[PDB]
Design an enzyme around this catalytic site. Sequence first.
Site, PDB file in Angstrom:
ATOM      1  N   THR A  37       0.859  -1.189   0.000  1.00  0.00           N
ATOM      2  CA  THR A  37       0.000   0.000   0.000  1.00  0.00           C
ATOM      3  C   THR A  37       0.897   1.241   0.000  1.00  0.00           C
ATOM      4  O   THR A  37       1.920   1.278   0.700  1.00  0.00           O
ATOM      5  CB  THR A  37      -0.921   0.030   1.255  1.00  0.00           C
ATOM      6  N   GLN A 114      -4.440  -7.665  -5.514  1.00  0.00           N
ATOM      7  CA  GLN A 114      -4.804  -8.095  -4.166  1.00  0.00           C
ATOM      8  C   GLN A 114      -6.149  -7.497  -3.753  1.00  0.00           C
ATOM      9  O   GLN A 114      -6.274  -6.281  -3.608  1.00  0.00           O
ATOM     10  CB  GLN A 114      -3.735  -7.715  -3.124  1.00  0.00           C
ATOM     11  N   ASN A 194      -2.710 -10.134   7.855  1.00  0.00           N
ATOM     12  CA  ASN A 194      -2.460  -8.832   8.464  1.00  0.00           C
ATOM     13  C   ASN A 194      -3.569  -8.182   9.284  1.00  0.00           C
ATOM     14  O   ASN A 194      -3.630  -6.960   9.387  1.00  0.00           O
ATOM     15  CB  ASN A 194      -1.933  -7.857   7.408  1.00  0.00           C
ATOM     16  N   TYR A 196      -6.808  -8.000   8.725  1.00  0.00           N
ATOM     17  CA  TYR A 196      -7.904  -7.383   7.999  1.00  0.00           C
ATOM     18  C   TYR A 196      -9.133  -8.297   8.143  1.00  0.00           C
ATOM     19  O   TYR A 196      -9.017  -9.367   8.731  1.00  0.00           O
ATOM     20  CB  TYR A 196      -7.462  -7.079   6.560  1.00  0.00           C
ATOM     21  N   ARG A 243      -3.201 -15.189   0.675  1.00  0.00           N
ATOM     22  CA  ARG A 243      -2.161 -14.681   1.554  1.00  0.00           C
ATOM     23  C   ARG A 243      -2.552 -14.915   3.014  1.00  0.00           C
ATOM     24  O   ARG A 243      -3.654 -14.576   3.428  1.00  0.00           O
ATOM     25  CB  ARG A 243      -1.895 -13.183   1.304  1.00  0.00           C
ATOM     26  N   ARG A 348       9.800  -3.861   1.602  1.00  0.00           N
ATOM     27  CA  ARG A 348      10.443  -2.569   1.783  1.00  0.00           C
ATOM     28  C   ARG A 348      11.571  -2.234   0.832  1.00  0.00           C
ATOM     29  O   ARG A 348      11.754  -1.067   0.496  1.00  0.00           O
ATOM     30  CB  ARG A 348      10.903  -2.406   3.227  1.00  0.00           C
ATOM     31  N   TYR A 375       3.890   6.566   2.746  1.00  0.00           N
ATOM     32  CA  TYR A 375       2.514   7.017   2.624  1.00  0.00           C
ATOM     33  C   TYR A 375       2.462   8.519   2.462  1.00  0.00           C
ATOM     34  O   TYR A 375       2.179   9.253   3.404  1.00  0.00           O
ATOM     35  CB  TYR A 375       1.717   6.636   3.863  1.00  0.00           C
TER      36      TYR A 375
HETATM   37  C1  LIG Z   1       4.690   0.609   3.017  1.00  0.00           C
HETATM   38  C2  LIG Z   1       4.151  -0.802   3.185  1.00  0.00           C
HETATM   39  C3  LIG Z   1       2.907  -1.146   2.633  1.00  0.00           C
HETATM   40  C4  LIG Z   1       2.426  -2.451   2.726  1.00  0.00           C
HETATM   41  N1  LIG Z   1       1.223  -2.715   2.148  1.00  0.00           N
HETATM   42  C5  LIG Z   1       0.726  -3.973   2.238  1.00  0.00           C
HETATM   43  C6  LIG Z   1      -0.556  -4.275   1.603  1.00  0.00           C
HETATM   44  O1  LIG Z   1      -1.154  -3.487   0.864  1.00  0.00           O
HETATM   45  N2  LIG Z   1      -1.042  -5.588   1.755  1.00  0.00           N
HETATM   46  C7  LIG Z   1      -0.309  -6.573   2.433  1.00  0.00           C
HETATM   47  O2  LIG Z   1      -0.783  -7.714   2.539  1.00  0.00           O
HETATM   48  N3  LIG Z   1       0.906  -6.292   2.986  1.00  0.00           N
HETATM   49  C8  LIG Z   1       1.436  -5.027   2.904  1.00  0.00           C
HETATM   50  N4  LIG Z   1       2.685  -4.756   3.439  1.00  0.00           N
HETATM   51  C9  LIG Z   1       3.540  -5.886   4.027  1.00  0.00           C
HETATM   52  C10 LIG Z   1       4.539  -6.413   2.920  1.00  0.00           C
HETATM   53  O3  LIG Z   1       3.795  -7.125   1.922  1.00  0.00           O
HETATM   54  C11 LIG Z   1       5.689  -7.345   3.467  1.00  0.00           C
HETATM   55  O4  LIG Z   1       5.168  -8.640   3.766  1.00  0.00           O
HETATM   56  C12 LIG Z   1       6.356  -6.794   4.669  1.00  0.00           C
HETATM   57  O5  LIG Z   1       6.843  -5.497   4.372  1.00  0.00           O
HETATM   58  C13 LIG Z   1       7.522  -7.676   5.086  1.00  0.00           C
HETATM   59  O6  LIG Z   1       8.534  -7.683   3.980  1.00  0.00           O
HETATM   60  P1  LIG Z   1       9.869  -6.785   4.012  1.00  0.00           P
HETATM   61  O7  LIG Z   1      10.622  -7.144   5.208  1.00  0.00           O
HETATM   62  O8  LIG Z   1      10.658  -7.316   2.712  1.00  0.00           O
HETATM   63  O9  LIG Z   1       9.487  -5.393   3.798  1.00  0.00           O
HETATM   64  C14 LIG Z   1       3.182  -3.458   3.403  1.00  0.00           C
HETATM   65  C15 LIG Z   1       4.420  -3.107   3.985  1.00  0.00           C
HETATM   66  C16 LIG Z   1       4.893  -1.771   3.899  1.00  0.00           C
HETATM   67  C17 LIG Z   1       6.180  -1.387   4.594  1.00  0.00           C
END
Ligand SMILES: Cc1cc2nc3c(=O)[nH]c(=O)nc-3n(C[C@H](O)[C@H](O)[C@H](O)COP(=O)(O)O)c2cc1C
EC number: 1.6.99.1
Length: 399
Positions: A37, A114, A194, A196, A243, A348, A375
């Site tokens: 997001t 998604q 997450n 939701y 997921r 990230r 954001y």
């Molecule tokens: C800015 C941001 C937005 C995210 N948006 C979503 C989202 O829309 N839906 C979702 O299931 N996870 C979302 N996540 C979680 C990521 O999909 C991911 O699983 C999480 O960041 C862990 O991975 P990383 O350590 O490589 O960042 C978001 C994470 C971040 C930091």
Amino acid sequence: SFVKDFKPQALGDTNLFKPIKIGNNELLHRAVIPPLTRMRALHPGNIPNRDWAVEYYTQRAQRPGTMIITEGAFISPQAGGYDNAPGVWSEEQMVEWTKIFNAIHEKKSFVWVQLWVLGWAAFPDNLARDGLRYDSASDNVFMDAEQEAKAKKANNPQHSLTKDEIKQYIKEYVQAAKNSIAAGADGVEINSANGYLLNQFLDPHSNTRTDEYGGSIENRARFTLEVVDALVEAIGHEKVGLRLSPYGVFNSMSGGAETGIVAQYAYVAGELEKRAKAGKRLAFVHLVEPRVTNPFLTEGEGEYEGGSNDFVYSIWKGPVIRAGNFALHPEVVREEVKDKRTLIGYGRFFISNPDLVDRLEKGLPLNKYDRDTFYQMSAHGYIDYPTYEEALKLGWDKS
Ligand SMILES: Cc1cc2nc3c(=O)[nH]c(=O)nc-3n(C[C@H](O)[C@H](O)[C@H](O)COP(=O)(O)O)c2cc1C
């Protein structure tokens, strides 16, 4: 600047670079972009950003054969609650999603949408403004202090879905999956993680129902499995993904504290493999690793060691995408991909590195991510992160 004390490791000699077929797509490598997001959508109407969306996605779809899972998209007005996250229910939205799907496809990559439904994670006031309810599994348990403050200030009390409102949500899931495929997406991912809505029904803390949708492992998973079955009947199993985040605690979920948490998820994974045998095997299973129990904590924080996602492999025999703090740990990834049906989601670091795949293959340094523009209604921190080459020309120390 580049990540300071990080010792990159070339990953080209691993399975991360061996092709694999997911759904109808033939990936040329296994690094996927997980749903992220970014709050750049336009209000009113939750219209995907007309000035920057295509650029951002085009940028990240540069390495051919990449599977891209889009930012969560609201399936309907009642599923939302964030003014700047995109929806996938109207023409005005689909007209912009199509342009986006085209750019990714022209770059020879793929895109899965998604489908998102907020539940108690939505802003009660935004929903009240538009005349929508503040939905959730139960009504005697809330997310957090400020959520209940917002809720009562707005006088939009958390509401327990009736069996008929749950069916209506199932209706909307199908329509949004159809609009997405029709507009040209390669597939859709059902977000049941997450904290939701669906996760709120799976979780014994957030779900204190006594009907056919709460009260037992079987009932808590019901809503999630009906969405699966409905979407599978509507657009085909090779176009559907699920997921899950077993140990996640984000949005007031139980995680490892719930002794029965592993059983709750093993059951879901089993029913999925059940259908797999009946011929209808989903495209994949996406798992959020316990390495990150909260996506808003710095890498290394909120790491759960009292539990592991490995049990899924004993039950589900299809492809599995694992996401969570893998970018700064190539050595960990190197072992995880030794398994032949594992994909790695880099969150990230796919934000700050439009050319992550190439930097991963070659073991090149990683651009730092600016946490503040995650954001923001801005192009800055969205589409201006440089590729390794540009970063060099800029002199991010190597001129
Ligand atoms: C800015 C941001 C937005 C995210 N948006 C979503 C989202 O829309 N839906 C979702 O299931 N996870 C979302 N996540 C979680 C990521 O999909 C991911 O699983 C999480 O960041 C862990 O991975 P990383 O350590 O490589 O960042 C978001 C994470 C971040 C930091």
